[PDB]
Structures are given as structure tokens and as C-alpha cells.
């Protein structure tokens, strides 16, 4: 009946905390932007420890791991651009003609002067540009030269995203929600703890999410304010749809030296046919997937309400299109074929047009732009569509109609798609509790 406080060191106690995480990935054989020269190798085996009886609240939208990853991708991009060749002298006036035998189709053959390696001497060379990179005043100029400076991506580096593990330091920990039907924030009954997350591929993408992790059981709808239209809508598929993306054009590259050491790689004349880049999607599987999504969608809008799908109708060219990277080239796909539907109460694979741009400012970056060097040979990448990003048209009249447009307003949403399950906490191992014990009297 006489109680005295007792110190316990190493008690299972944690608090919500934001700390600086770090990278981790298994060692491979080069030089990709994300791995850099060095990122700590992963443990051969991670120890994922289930925590019985433990219920913790998760919030994917107020999560700081997202903001950290966002700034990390941006900063990594700039760290990779510094040593490469900056194309400040490439803002010379371009004398351009259309290709010339265009039956039904844009890309333009241009000629221009260029500084050689000697300052004083000049060369007249020619290059082929996809007409998104140039604008007129036949005289032309690069799109970027009035907005920002430009630098050329080094040829060696690869833009092929590899799994990255985010780790928290000792004394902190990561909680992982394993609740299958987890609707995007809330209490997670089944929670396990790890020091590092699983391999998250930093896939740079717009509208549809590519090569990601699939939700088990039902497809999952994650938002921040479901009745609100301004906030985007995250979709995680249970079945991945397969999408085959190719640039058929036989691109040949030449190397012109523009200064001491500096060497620009330019798109030579195409050899063979002129075909436009495209992406195929099995209409059957995409119709099943679209069906299953609207089944889970109607759980939030009453039950036989009219759910239609329309195209993107807002914003710049770089945001309205499914932008991504494939083999080196940057694809801007028009996704009108998929989102042209209405829902109430042979192979036939859909085909999607894709244009190509070599000058790019991703993540709303105004400032130092990048020139994607031309890629030799025909390109073909097979990818998974594991998620989606949707947006409403506005306050709908509520049980009257529901029209959906795909968006990609912000790039963090892509990190939220794979970091929805993880949360960072700090261990407070000091607990004091009363027992009927006293220390030896002085």
C-alpha cells in the first residue's frame, strides 16, 4: 500500500516523429541517378516483426516520408545534371522544314550553325527535332531558350527505376499497415514494424501509375476528402493491366563536338519508315478493371448513380498527358481512348497515341531544363499499370451524375501511392511505473 516509482528502460513506447531517413539498395553492376556512386547495401534479410494487438492510426496525406522522397528525387535529378554538358550555345536560330513526304501525320528537319571546338571556327550541321521542342517566329528556335537555360543528360546514366528502400535510423522505427481493405487513413488493426520499407520503384509518371504494388482483395480508393473534388483520387488496382509501349522509329545518332571536351549527340536522319510511338492495352482486361473500380466507387456516391468517364480538359500539355520515361525517351501519351465511357445500374487491344519530347521540365521545375539525348534503335518497354489518379469535374448535383477526368497535378501523389502503408515513429524507451519497492535506505 506504499507505492514507489520505478524506472524501466526499453519499454515499448513510441510517439509520432519526423526524422531524416536515408536510402538503401542491394549492390548491382552503370551509374544510375538514384543509386548514385553509393547507397548503403540492404541487409541480406529484413526482419519484419508483427505486433499483435497493436492498433495505430495512419495518415498517408499528412505523411512526411512523402515530402522527403519528393525533395530527394528533385535534388537527385539536379545532382546528376551538374557534370554533364550544358547546351547554352544551342539557342541559335534554326532554319527548319517539315519532313516533306508526310502523308498523314510533324517532326521537322532543321539546319543551323554551331560553335566547333575552336572558338573562332564554326560548323553548319543539321538535326531532327520533334516539333514540340521548337517554335517559330522558315525560322525556328528551341521552346526552352526564352524560359530557362538547358543542359544535356549524360549518355551513360539510365532512367530505369530500381527498387529503393527507405530506412529510419536506430532509435526510430517504421510501422507498416497490412490491412487489406485499408481505406487511406485510419486505425490499422494488423500492424508490423520494420527498420526499412520494401523496394519502392521511383517511377516518374502522370495519370496512370506504373510498375507499382497491387492491393490485395478489393481495389482500393484513397483520397483526403471524398466529397471534395479539388483533392485528387488515388486508385490501387488488384489486377495489373499490361501496357506495351514502343517507339518504332529507327533513330540514328551522330556526335558533333561543340567545344573543348563538350560533345553534343544529335538525332540523325531516320532510316526506314516513319511510324509514331504508341501503347497497346487489352480492351477486355481494361474493361474488367474499369468495371471493378466503379463497383468500389459507388460505395461512396449512393448506388445506381450515373458514373461516366471523360478525358482530361485542364492544364498544360505536360500534365494533361500520360507523361513517363521508356528506354531513355520521354513519352506524352493521349489517354482519350480509355476514359470515354458511361456506367449505370478478337483481342481488340486499345491503342494509345504517344508524342515524344526531348526538352522537359518535370515536377513543375522552371529553371535548368534537360535535353533527353536521342536513343539509337527501336524502343519497346512492357510495363504494368498498377494504379490511377482521378479527379471530379466539380460539385456534382449528387445522385444525378458523376463524371471523372484523369489528372496528375502534383508528383507527390505518386509517392503516396507506395508510401501509404508506412509511418515513422520515435522510440521513447523511458517508462516510470509504481511498484511496492524501495531502494536500499541510506
Amino acid at each position: 500500500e506504499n507505492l514507489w516509482v520505478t524506472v524501466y528502460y526499453g519499454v515499448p513506447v513510441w510517439k509520432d516523429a519526423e526524422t531524416t531517413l536515408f536510402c538503401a539498395s542491394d549492390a548491382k553492376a552503370k551509374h544510375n541517378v538514384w543509386a548514385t556512386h553509393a547507397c548503403v547495401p540492404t541487409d541480406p534479410n529484413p526482419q519484419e516483426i508483427h505486433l499483435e494487438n497493436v492498433t495505430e492510426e495512419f495518415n498517408m496525406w499528412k505523411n512526411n516520408m512523402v515530402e522527403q522522397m519528393h525533395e530527394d528525387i528533385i535534388s537527385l535529378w539536379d545532382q546528376s545534371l551538374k557534370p554533364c554538358v550544358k547546351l547554352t550555345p544551342l539557342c541559335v536560330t534554326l532554319q527548319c522544314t517539315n519532313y516533306a513526304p508526310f502523308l498523314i501525320n510533324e517532326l521537322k528537319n532543321c539546319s543551323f550553325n554551331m560553335t566547333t571546338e575552336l572558338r573562332d571556327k564554326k560548323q553548319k550541321v543539321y538535326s531532327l527535332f520533334y516539333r514540340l521542342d521548337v517554335v517559330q517566329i522558315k525560322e525556328y528556335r528551341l521552346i526552352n531558350c526564352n524560359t530557362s537555360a538547358i543542359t544535356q543528360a549524360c549518355p551513360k546514366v539510365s532512367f530505369e527505376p530500381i527498387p529503393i528502400h527507405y530506412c529510419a535510423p536506430a532509435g526510430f522505427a517504421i510501422l507498416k499497415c497490412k490491412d487489406k481493405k485499408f481505406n487511406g487513413t485510419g486505425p490499422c488493426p494488423s500492424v508490423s514494424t520494420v527498420q526499412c520499407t520494401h523496394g519502392i520503384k521511383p517511377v516518374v509518371s502522370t495519370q496512370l501509375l506504373l510498375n507499382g504494388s497491387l492491393a490485395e482483395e478489393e481495389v482500393i480508393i484513397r483520397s483526403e476528402n471524398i466529397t471534395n473534388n479539388a483533392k485528387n483520387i488515388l486508385v490501387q488496382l488488384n489486377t495489373p493491366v499490361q501496357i506495351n509501349c514502343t517507339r518504332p522509329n529507327n533513330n540514328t545518332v551522330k556526335s558533333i563536338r561543340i567545344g573543348p571536351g563538350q560533345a553534343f549527340y544529335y538525332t540523325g536522319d531516320i532510316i526506314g519508315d516513319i511510324r509514331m510511338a504508341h501503347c497497346n492495352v487489352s480492351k477486355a482486361t481494361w474493361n474488367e478493371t474499369l468495371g471493378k473500380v466503379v463497383k468500389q466507387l459507388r460505395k461512396h456516391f449512393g448506388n445506381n448513380t450515373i458514373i461516366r468517364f471523360a478525358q482530361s480538359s485542364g492544364g498544360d500539355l505536360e500534365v494533361t498527358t500520360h507523361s513517363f520515361n521508356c528506354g531513355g525517351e520521354f513519352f506524352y501519351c493521349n489517354t482519350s481512348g480509355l476514359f470515354n465511357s458511361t456506367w449505370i445500374s478478337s483481342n481488340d487491344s486499345i491503342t494509345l497515341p504517344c508524342r515524344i519530347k526531348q526538352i522537359i521540365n518535370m515536377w513543375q521545375r522552371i529553371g535548368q531544363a534537360m535535353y533527353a539525348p536521342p536513343i539509337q534503335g527501336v524502343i519497346r518497354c512492357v510495363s504494368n499499370i498498377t494504379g490511377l489518379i482521378l479527379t471530379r469535374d466539380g460539385g456534382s448535383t449528387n445522385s444525378t451524375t458523376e463524371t471523372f477526368r484523369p489528372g496528375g497535378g502534383d508528383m507527390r501523389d505518386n509517392w503516396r501511392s507506395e508510401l501509404y502503408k508506412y509511418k515513422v515513429v520515435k522510440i521513447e524507451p523511458l517508462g516510470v511505473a509504481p511498484t511496492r519497492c524501495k531502494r536500499r535506505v541510506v
Partner: protein, 122 residues
């Protein structure tokens, strides 16, 4: 049973108190990494600092001379140790941890050593 790091986070405080070594092991073991490693040893040394001023440096558990003021919690032994988790306990005793830590260094260690000098003075 050994359930692992934080294995008994959701068990009763009495059951969890048996596996303090489990949480104790992993509790200590370029720029981002380095700053993180410094933060880790900094937090660990803070807790070891508090155990120091409470005279409990080498032990995981130690008993004190501070009595339990009933204003802190009105529960008993059985209700605390066989019905609650350390998490919800730390939440209930989140208004006093500063206060209890201050009494913990002062009431005993700030008077255990003075009496120690006056006692070993012969």
C-alpha cells in the same frame, strides 16, 4: 517466448517488462546518413543521461524513493500491470513525466549523495 523487437508493445505492461533487453539491443545499432547516425547516438545518450542522474546507469529497472502521488493515476497494481499497455500508460502519465523526472533527480539523487557525503564523512 521471444517475439522480437517491440514484440510486447501490445501486451500488458507486466508481460512487456520481461523483455526489456529485446528493445535495448537494437536501440543503438552520405550527409543524410551521417546526420541520422548522430541523431541516434544523441537520443540514446540522452536517455542514458537521465538514467545517470537517477542513479540507474547500469540497470534496466531500478526502484526509487519517490512516493506515488495519487493525483498522477488512481489505478492499483493489478489494474496497471495486468490490464494496460505501456503505450496507453505513457499517454496517461504524459502530464507528469517532466514533473516526475524532476522529482526523480532531486528528491532522491540530489539528496542521496548529500547524505552519502555526510555519512562517509567518518
Amino acid at each position: 517466448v521471444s517475439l522480437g523487437f517491440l514484440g510486447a508493445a501490445g501486451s500488458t505492461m507486466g508481460a512487456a517488462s520481461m523483455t526489456l533487453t529485446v528493445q535495448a539491443r537494437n536501440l543503438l545499432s552520405g550527409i543524410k546518413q551521417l546526420q541520422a547516425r548522430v541523431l541516434a547516438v544523441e537520443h540514446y545518450l540522452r536517455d542514458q543521461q537521465l538514467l545517470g542522474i537517477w542513479g540507474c546507469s547500469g540497470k534496466l529497472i531500478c526502484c526509487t524513493n519517490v512516493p506515488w502521488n495519487s493525483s498522477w493515476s488512481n489505478r492499483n497494481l493489478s489494474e496497471i500491470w495486468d490490464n494496460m499497455t505501456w503505450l496507453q500508460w505513457d499517454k496517461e502519465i504524459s502530464n507528469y513525466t517532466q514533473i516526475i523526472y524532476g522529482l526523480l533527480e532531486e528528491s532522491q539523487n540530489q539528496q542521496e549523495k548529500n547524505e552519502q557525503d555526510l555519512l562517509a564523512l567518518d
